[PDB]
Assembly symmetry: C3
Homo-oligomer: 32 residues x 3
């Protein structure tokens, strides 16, 4: 069950990184 | 402690899904 | 390995909270 949790956590990590990139773009006016 | 971690992870999953929906809306001009 | 997972989860929690704050700002027109 530990390994399954790590995989969920890793999936959230990638989701969160992609969210951070989009939000920083929206907030700074990146890429227009 | 494993079960408590899963509940935290699940809470983040719902937070992250709601974040993804809002950010996709902001970025595509959904709902005006 | 349990403790290392909790630290990752906690890091995501702080990331997610900061994302929620920025997204709520973008969506309500906070701070201009």
């Amino acid at each position: 069950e530990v390994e399954a949790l790590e995989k969920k956590v890793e999936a959230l990590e990638a989701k969160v990184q992609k969210l951070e990139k989009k939000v920083e773009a929206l907030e700074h006016g990146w890429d227009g």
